[PDB]
Amino acid sequence: MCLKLNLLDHVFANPFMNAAGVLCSTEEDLRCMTASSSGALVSKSCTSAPRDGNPEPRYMAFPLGSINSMGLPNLGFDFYLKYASDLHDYSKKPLFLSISGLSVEENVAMVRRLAPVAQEKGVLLELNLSCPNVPGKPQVAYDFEAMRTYLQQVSLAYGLPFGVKMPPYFDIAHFDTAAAVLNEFPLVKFVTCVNSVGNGLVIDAESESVVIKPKQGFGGLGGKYILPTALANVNAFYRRCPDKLVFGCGGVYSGEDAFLHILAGASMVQVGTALQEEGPGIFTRLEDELLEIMARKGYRTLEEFRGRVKTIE
Amino acid sequence: MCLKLNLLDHVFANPFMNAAGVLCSTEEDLRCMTASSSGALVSKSCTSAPRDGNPEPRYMAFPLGSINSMGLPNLGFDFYLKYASDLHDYSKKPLFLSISGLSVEENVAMVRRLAPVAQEKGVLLELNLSCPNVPGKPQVAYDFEAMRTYLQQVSLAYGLPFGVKMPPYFDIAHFDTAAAVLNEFPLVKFVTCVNSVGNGLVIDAESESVVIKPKQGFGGLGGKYILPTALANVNAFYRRCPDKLVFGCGGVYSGEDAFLHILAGASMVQVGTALQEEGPGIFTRLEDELLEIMARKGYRTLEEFRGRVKTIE
């Protein structure tokens, strides 16, 4: 009875890792994630230039989840790359590195210099497609031409196995089109579903006011709000992309939450809000909780139920 | 004090009504909603010919909300016209009629027959742009060309003010495009944000089975899961449609939930999931709580705080 996984030529103690942007921006953050009992870790998405991001407050949490418009605050590519090549203990766990370039050029430039270190040290790319292109156009993964572009281009400049962080979709036709595009690109070896449910609005009854300063309160949604949505996308893409892995992300608070993610076809399982709220010790609970579930049912490895969600007569 | 308001040349005892689909498919249902305290009611969306709809189980509720894939079961448009025509006590409360035709021809064929009754009896048309087509192509509302056709052809056919039931958007560039489309049509006098959040997926951990038979378990979400999504679209279209009303729908369980919807810009507040779960008694509670909030804050009218949520700096 174990949680072990092998994939993308790496061995993982458990399938629990953090969601990009949570406890992973600084060297302090990263050492703390590595000192944790997480299976993996992933660095805050990067741009070439360091960024402050939006004005505060810009993230808040509640009984049922969180809202954020951080605006991509990070220390710049050069730091995260240097953490990859010099500072990270791969013997502790594998590392993923997230890039969120604000144009296709910026993403190409970074991966080109990531390439050698990916090859030499084993760090794994999560390309963040749930990012903004030209303002007044939809975020990139909602714009399938821009999506095709980004993947052809990055593929060519990286030429190594990599994964993509996707936003939630809500129409079948979008599921259909998006997976087909992704299936064009053999180097895309995993798909991460899902990013924040975009542009929700949280209002405080007492003060009669939005809770985050940027975009007139509007922001990305996570936590218990987005779980079914996330199980939908995970299982959507699990079904439509049998040559890729899906990594689940969306409202994981509990072993049962992960158990359902895996049932839907999740290989790795990321924790965002719930981790921001409870902190890094969340990962020992999640492990134990899931293993109690597995015990109750007589499951001994994860593959014994991954993708094995039943449907009805 | 009382929650009276005037909209669209009608009087309402208070801004609450059911969400289309909930307690409104049979004559028995519509009599019940009429007997309730709702200030208004709306008919189940309908189609020219009756529909049996999808296999059961097709709807399920849980502590955080609901999932459904009913498949537009309905008694057919002739029944709902007859109800609007000869059966409804307009002295009690106004009636809206929802129409969710599978083509633009189907809709046109229904509105022309409805127009005389709307003139004669005052019934109101809520057009549902959340339906088939197809597959191979997105919902009408996520296809801004197909929406323009639907609005043109119905605007031309019906010729009296009506409103539209919109599905949620998640991208700013869609809010901008979406609303430009709706602003092209002076007859579109109100927008209902928002329909169920599309294609979520609830999995039961004990059975390890989806919970709704149709579509391998995939369906529309409502309830607490979607509240800040509904508040975002209410407000987003409140802001871009100064000459339209907005009717808020999505995740009202309390008076506080309504208060927020109103703050976002809502004129009418719709109740779907919570109504389906608690029954029509929920209208006396919702009224009481909302009124209790108002008194505590020193508000005498809905107009005093409609649309007035505060941003920060």
Ligand SMILES: Cc1cc2nc3c(=O)[nH]c(=O)nc-3n(C[C@H](O)[C@H](O)[C@H](O)COP(=O)(O)O)c2cc1C
């Ligand atoms: C504060 C915060 C920062 C985030 N930063 C990033 C980021 O830099 N890159 C990214 O791809 N996703 C980012 N996300 C999205 C999360 O990775 C995840 O998709 C989302 O929060 C849903 O997960 P949850 O429901 O477990 O929170 C962020 C989320 C939050 C709350």
Ligand SMILES: Cc1cc2nc3c(=O)[nH]c(=O)nc-3n(C[C@H](O)[C@H](O)[C@H](O)COP(=O)(O)O)c2cc1C
């Ligand atoms: C069982 C059920 C049936 C529904 N039927 C319809 C319908 O015929 N037409 C429609 O526009 N919306 C329909 N809806 C969507 C609701 O009117 C509403 O947009 C959604 O449930 C969100 O409101 P809630 O959060 O209060 O449930 C239905 C929802 C449910 C749960």
Ligand SMILES: O=C(O)c1[nH]c(=O)[nH]c(=O)c1CCc1ccc2c(C(=O)O)cccc2c1
């Ligand atoms: O840093 C973020 O805002 C963020 N938050 C998330 O929940 N998921 C993410 O992928 C990101 C980074 C991508 C992102 C998102 C929003 C913006 C925005 C914004 O829409 O506020 C502005 C500038 C850059 C961004 C970059």
Ligand SMILES: O=C(O)c1[nH]c(=O)[nH]c(=O)c1CCc1ccc2c(C(=O)O)cccc2c1
């Ligand atoms: O009757 C419904 O299933 C239904 N459920 C909702 O949550 N919102 C609605 O607007 C409706 C009626 C319109 C509708 C929506 C989706 C479908 C679907 C579907 O998207 O699976 C299939 C067949 C008919 C439908 C009719």
